[PDB]
Symmetry: C4
Subunit: 271 residues, 4 copies
Amino acid sequence: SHMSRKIRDLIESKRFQNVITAIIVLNGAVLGLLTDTTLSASSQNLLERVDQLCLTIFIVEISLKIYAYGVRGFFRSGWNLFDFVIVAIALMPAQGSLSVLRTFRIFRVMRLVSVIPTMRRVVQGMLLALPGVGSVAALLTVVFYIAAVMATNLYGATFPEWFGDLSKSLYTLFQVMTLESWSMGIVRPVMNVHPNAWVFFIPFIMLTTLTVLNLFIGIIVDAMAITKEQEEEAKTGHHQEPISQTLLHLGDRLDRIEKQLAQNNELLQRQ
Amino acid sequence: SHMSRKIRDLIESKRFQNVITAIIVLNGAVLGLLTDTTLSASSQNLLERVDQLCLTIFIVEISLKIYAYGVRGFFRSGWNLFDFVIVAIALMPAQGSLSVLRTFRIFRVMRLVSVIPTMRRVVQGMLLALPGVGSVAALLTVVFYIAAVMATNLYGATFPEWFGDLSKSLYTLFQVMTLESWSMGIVRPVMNVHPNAWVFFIPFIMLTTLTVLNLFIGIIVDAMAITKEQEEEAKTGHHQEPISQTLLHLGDRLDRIEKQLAQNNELLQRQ
Amino acid sequence: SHMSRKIRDLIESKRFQNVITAIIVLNGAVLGLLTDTTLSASSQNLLERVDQLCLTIFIVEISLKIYAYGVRGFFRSGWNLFDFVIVAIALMPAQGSLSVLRTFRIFRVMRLVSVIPTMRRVVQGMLLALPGVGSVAALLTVVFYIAAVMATNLYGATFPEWFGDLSKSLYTLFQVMTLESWSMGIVRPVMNVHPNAWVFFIPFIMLTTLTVLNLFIGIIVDAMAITKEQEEEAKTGHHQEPISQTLLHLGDRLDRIEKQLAQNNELLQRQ
Amino acid sequence: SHMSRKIRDLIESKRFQNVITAIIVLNGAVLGLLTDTTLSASSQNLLERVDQLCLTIFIVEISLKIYAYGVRGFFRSGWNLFDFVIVAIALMPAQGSLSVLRTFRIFRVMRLVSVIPTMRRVVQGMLLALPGVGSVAALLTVVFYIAAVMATNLYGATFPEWFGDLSKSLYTLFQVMTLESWSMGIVRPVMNVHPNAWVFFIPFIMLTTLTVLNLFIGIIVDAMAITKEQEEEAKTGHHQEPISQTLLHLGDRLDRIEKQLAQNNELLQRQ
Ligand SMILES: CC/C(=C(\c1ccc(O)cc1)c1ccc(OCCN(C)C)cc1)c1ccccc1
Ligand SMILES: CC/C(=C(\c1ccc(O)cc1)c1ccc(OCCN(C)C)cc1)c1ccccc1
Ligand SMILES: CC/C(=C(\c1ccc(O)cc1)c1ccc(OCCN(C)C)cc1)c1ccccc1
Ligand SMILES: CC/C(=C(\c1ccc(O)cc1)c1ccc(OCCN(C)C)cc1)c1ccccc1
Ligand SMILES: CC/C(=C(\c1ccc(O)cc1)c1ccc(OCCN(C)C)cc1)c1ccccc1
Ligand SMILES: CC/C(=C(\c1ccc(O)cc1)c1ccc(OCCN(C)C)cc1)c1ccccc1
Ligand SMILES: CC/C(=C(\c1ccc(O)cc1)c1ccc(OCCN(C)C)cc1)c1ccccc1
Ligand SMILES: CC/C(=C(\c1ccc(O)cc1)c1ccc(OCCN(C)C)cc1)c1ccccc1
Ligand SMILES: CCCCCCCCCC(=O)N(CCO)C[C@@H](O)[C@@H](O)[C@@H](O)[C@@H](O)CO
Ligand SMILES: CCCCCCCCCC(=O)N(CCO)C[C@@H](O)[C@@H](O)[C@@H](O)[C@@H](O)CO
Ligand SMILES: CCCCCCCCCC(=O)N(CCO)C[C@@H](O)[C@@H](O)[C@@H](O)[C@@H](O)CO
Ligand SMILES: CCCCCCCCCC(=O)N(CCO)C[C@@H](O)[C@@H](O)[C@@H](O)[C@@H](O)CO
Ligand code: NA
Ligand code: NA
Ligand code: NA
């Protein structure tokens, strides 16, 4: 229709993005002021209404989009669904789920990612890089589970605060992996009772730090290449051959042209 | 034979892998529940039998493989030998070795690596990357030994808990390398007695952190390329020229084709 | 003019650079000696005059440059403007700004960067690499703000020293991100009152360490390539195609020449 | 001569290298046993003689080399000079230098690097990578000096143990850069007296961690490429074009051959 044609161009305008961005920043700034308990009852009521104002502008924004794109058209984008859920959850009447409350209204500032395209790209590259490190992430999960069971059996009776159960052991092994007081706080005290405890903890540190670095480098290198590759697909409109494919086949492509040159030289030398 | 033909296809089926995977997870989950000492005698006896059930399924699995592939055929794979040793050790009657016990039945969860091919590849790439960092690993071992001897001679009489002997010094130098309370916990106290101790510990930290990072980056970069190269060899069936060789000879290959072009141009300009 | 021709060649001479370098080192060395409060009143007065001498040589240096290049010519370089501001601020009479004093005369040693070209290049590569990581830096800023608001609401009433307000929470979240006593000092004490606090802090650590590593790797890789690319532009005088462009179009360029070879082969086989 | 022909081939034999390697390990193992103060006077005298035996074998080894290569020929290699100095210093009668003693006989184990070629290559690549990071290393040195002077002036009167003088401040800034108790141990106590101290320490941490990572990544990436490039020069005998040069000129080389193809196509289409 005509009403669903200008609205899309209003939605796609730089100023509309900037207006929404300004309202996200504003909502975020009022939620930060609401952390101050010394504020007067009138100041709290004022900011709570600016929060209500900000939220209503997001209901108008999402409705404008659902109409101008359609239910199937809007929910076709993962970013729009995320934007929908962020706003729709604020109007959820006693939602049934394992948690505590929804005071986490500050997760509305996470919309700065979906609304700013330079930031949307960064998060997109990182998210697209996750499936590819699933195996490394699972190997790290296996090492933690094996280690947690071993630590609970070995040290739980003598160190119940740190290794009393599986939960306690996963928490202190995560601390050990982060190298946080691993020796002065955990292993030297454990070695006073179990002198060969270093046989367990030093290999655990060696293995988990390498794996977590592997996981992190893997995510970073992939996210960087995916982003670069997507920017090129956006600029030209043509599909970008991933760099790994270009590098894997560089040898094959060079020898083929070397051979095609030699046969063109053979037909040339004898004419 | 006919009996050693369908069994191989049963062994190679996705559902058989999934059945074994489910039994590994199950065994791992019952071993984790067995860390809880508050459980009733009947609950402990129940889970211990589910452990026996899981173990028997692995004996049937390995036997099925040894028959369908042969002794020489099965033990030709490093992964199958690993799978054999994991299961066979659970039936080892008082094995003679320097240790304590075999309560580490949880190392059976490490079979998730050998049974899941996406995880088998990750560990394979990492293991194939180790011989190549042997020299860096040995340099780190030399620096630790020299440092341990120096620290024992310099500080062992005044700081016996940390440097009293070689073992004690290797342990606290490893802690120092991990930057764990290196200054507030070790070096500021040591400097109160030996004021120039920083001349020993600051260069030691500078050298070992660079070397350990070198070792780790070396493993990660190699494991990533080896995996990528093996996936390409698996996809096409052709041997993949390692990227280092492609990069080292990129210059040579380009100038050769440049020259072959210039000589083809020379025969063309004068015909 | 003739007076603004030899001065430029004096300014561009290796010995003039070395003379200025020697005066920066000298000024830096006297400012370091002036940190010693045990010095006699005559020794303090002596060094304070060597500081005055060093400062005057920089006024002569900058004036020499402004004359030999012109106001528009001198201030056309970001490095010269930096050099101008460093020297000009020492003669600022009670400048109006939010601070405390200008005792930070030691920021004059930062001129070793602008005066030594090998060091000017390093800092240049790093500075040119910053706009490109602005989105990652902003994502990290968003995560910190959301987390600070959450931590203030959740823990500020029970842990006011660490989370009492927004400022306090940003400071302890930065400490948590650096892994400094995150568990023994902050989270184990917080968990004694709020047992599921690990649900907040472990994901926060996981997310911020990956993002800060991403930010850092991004800066390092870019600064390294920018420097390499600028050295090549300086050596040849020709514009250097950035490596990302060379890599993105490597596939396209190889298939195009492959096709141009095949069509040259087609005209050759049938002549 | 004939006597200086077979000795060189004896010196270059795998077994001679292995004999020297075995004597280095042996000397290192006896020096490690000599750290144990509980040993009997006869055991100490025994090991001290095995040290004398090991040292004499190195005097015979070096003399054998100086004769078989010549004074100019032997001292032409940096590795041989290092090997000469390690052995010659053990016979230095009260050498005049600023130190304490030469009990550091364990630095003789550092010969395992010069004697094992796979380890000699690793250290060689690392040493050749140092001149290239000199500017980054100097930038880090400048930041530390500026920071040390600032910290001494700002905090030395109120925190004399940590910032009382320049030496004290460089030591605690190095600790701060390593993130070792930077907040719970240094900055939270400093902020109790100087509440805006975080304005100094948080930027200092941000800047030095990025620079030290830059320095380290720079060394690692260069050492890896230098080693790879030297192995190729050793294998073929031909000079290896450094990868940076191959990558910088990849664009130029591809467009040149693209143009040479188009002109060969132009002469072909009209014959
Ligand atoms: C196209 C980028 C990419 C990868 C890549 C990124 C950067 C780069 O420099 C090279 C490659 C990539 C390649 C392989 C990969 O394997 C994951 C293995 N699974 C089974 C765990 C993951 C990402 C990829 C991402 C998702 C699916 C498939 C491929
Ligand atoms: C050596 C080039 C390379 C890769 C590569 C190797 C051979 C080849 O033919 C093509 C590329 C590389 C790049 C990315 C990569 O991603 C997979 C990571 N997993 C963990 C998701 C693997 C190898 C690389 C490895 C680590 C860091 C940066 C680059
Ligand atoms: C084929 C991959 C590879 C290496 C490699 C991996 C990734 C990459 O981007 C480039 C190369 C490799 C190359 C050299 C190397 O040297 C080790 C030196 N020893 C003597 C300590 C190790 C791995 C390699 C692995 C085992 C043996 C030989 C080579
Ligand atoms: C610069 C490209 C490169 C290597 C390279 C340099 C020159 C060349 O002609 C070919 C490749 C590189 C890659 C891997 C590598 O592995 C050996 C590591 N050892 C420690 C096992 C060495 C250099 C590299 C170095 C560090 C990280 C990622 C990539
Ligand atoms: C030319 C180097 C470069 C980049 C680069 C450096 C090294 C390298 O190996 C590859 C590329 C670069 C490329 C992309 C980039 O995107 C930033 C995204 N913004 C929107 C946050 C940044 C730097 C760049 C720097 C400034 C502006 C534009 C490009
Ligand atoms: C795999 C090669 C690569 C990049 C690359 C991928 C594909 C392509 O066609 C060209 C290059 C790479 C290099 C730099 C880069 O910079 C942007 C970083 N942002 C965060 C500023 C992105 C990808 C790279 C990624 C991480 C570290 C080192 C190298
Ligand atoms: C040939 C390797 C190399 C460099 C290099 C190594 C690996 C790689 O992937 C690319 C290049 C290199 C290049 C530049 C460089 O600049 C140093 C700047 N100085 C002025 C501080 C250093 C090393 C180099 C080493 C010494 C002198 C000159 C060049
Ligand atoms: C993007 C490829 C690259 C470099 C590169 C960029 C452009 C170009 O045309 C050629 C190479 C690279 C490699 C090494 C390097 O060394 C200098 C380091 N200094 C600090 C000694 C610089 C850039 C690189 C950068 C960081 C890590 C690994 C690889
Ligand atoms: C990838 C690795 C992921 C590790 C995740 C750890 C989750 C387990 C933490 C948890 O739920 N706890 C129960 C809830 O309290 C245990 C910790 O709280 C406990 O270890 C201690 O901190 C103290 O409670 C007891 O001293
Ligand atoms: C690559 C580097 C590898 C370093 C490996 C260190 C192994 C040595 C540890 C060991 O076997 N110990 C004896 C067994 O107790 C010593 C430690 O336990 C000891 O240093 C202290 O922790 C206390 O026991 C004394 O205060
Ligand atoms: C990218 C992340 C950037 C984080 C930047 C943090 C700035 C906030 C620090 C600040 O201005 N403070 C007020 C000035 O004191 C707060 C800290 O000082 C406070 O948290 C504590 O250290 C104690 O003062 C109270 O226990
Ligand atoms: C690239 C960065 C390089 C930093 C190098 C630091 C060298 C300075 C260390 C030194 O020589 N000291 C004098 C010798 O004692 C000072 C330290 O010892 C001192 O800071 C404290 O540790 C205590 O002595 C006082 O509380
Ligand atoms: Na740390
Ligand atoms: Na710590
Ligand atoms: Na730490």
